[PDB]
């Protein structure tokens, strides 16, 4: 897979 | 000899990216505590799009780790190794303000949307589109989040679908963008390893992640990133000139004396001072910066600042900040424009700057001219730009915001003057 994210 | 933890991630406002006082994100500051933790030094290695990050993570030899605020998928398949979650995120379809609120997932069929490449909502959708086959959306390796984003806002592509998160720290820079609804229940974010014979890496971050749960590191870092702020918002002349007179008094004799003393329009101070303070010198930011003149403590030290909440020492500190920054500006730029560009330095940082110069350059603008350059500043927020760049993503709109805000107080405090 998976990944917007931070 | 190794001593050095290799961490591939994305450059983007939310994992890691480059601001006026060297590298910082989410992402960034906890992988570096962790590198600390393990007395190693810490390298980020930033990836080109998804697949490629991936790609890099599982071939030898091949950085340590994935930190990019990634969703862990299917567990069975060893070949990627996830970590404990970090932060907790919901997927959320997003539309535009003015346009119709989508309500149920079906409702996203024949509608413009673009999401990242080879990303987790790439894959939501290509499981709905076989509920329904006409569903139809686009996906690219040109563009970071922040890009779909800005998309959305103005109006380029309808919908999008990105992690909670990604809103929580840049819906305020868009402010068009809206939740339809939530798209997917809540889930962790983690840390990518390869697969994966030896446990030791992998032990040794979840050893963290756990512990830095119950210090509280991550609420903390959640709270320092996760809470919106930046460049303020211009205050209208109504309350500007409430503060000519409520605020201006206490330090126009020390904006003065610090113009006298560099050589400069002590007025180009004041504004820099307001847009950064409100003229308020316990002012405070959990980014770091505090005093008048929204100082960070490294450069506080290095402008003679013993005492940030000092207004007088702020002042002192900043303005001598600003027009050293001015002078190290090259040759070619000339006034007006140099203190134009000084501004944007302010803000931005010069190495950043200096991306935007070389961008007008190729781009056949004048690389001397603020009003050129500052068509180039916002690009470096989009994908397909900053890539091509050494610093690479940096929110420039918020610079131009920044600097055309200081010199609108610059020219109502030069008419209140002036004689
Ligand atoms: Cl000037």
Redesign the interface.
Known sequence: X?X?XX | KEGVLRVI??N?????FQDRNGET???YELAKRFAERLGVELKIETADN?DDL?AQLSREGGPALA???????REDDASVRYSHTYLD?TPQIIYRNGQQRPTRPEDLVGKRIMV?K????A?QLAELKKQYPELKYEESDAVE?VDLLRMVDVGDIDLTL??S??LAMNQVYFPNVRVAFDFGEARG?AWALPGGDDDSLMNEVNAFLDQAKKEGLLQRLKDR?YGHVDVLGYVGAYTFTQHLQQRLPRYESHFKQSGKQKDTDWRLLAAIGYQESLWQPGATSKTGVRGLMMLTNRTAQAMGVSNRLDPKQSIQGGSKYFVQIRSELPESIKEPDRSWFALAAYNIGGAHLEDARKMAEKEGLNPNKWLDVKKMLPRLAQKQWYAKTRYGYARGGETVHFVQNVRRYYDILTWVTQS
Do not use: C, I, M
């Open positions: 998976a917007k | 991630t994305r983007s406002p939310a994992t890691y994100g989410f992402e998804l991936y930190a990019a605020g990634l969703t862990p998928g995120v990242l080879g990303s987790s909502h894959e989040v990105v992690d998160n990604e974010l990133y």
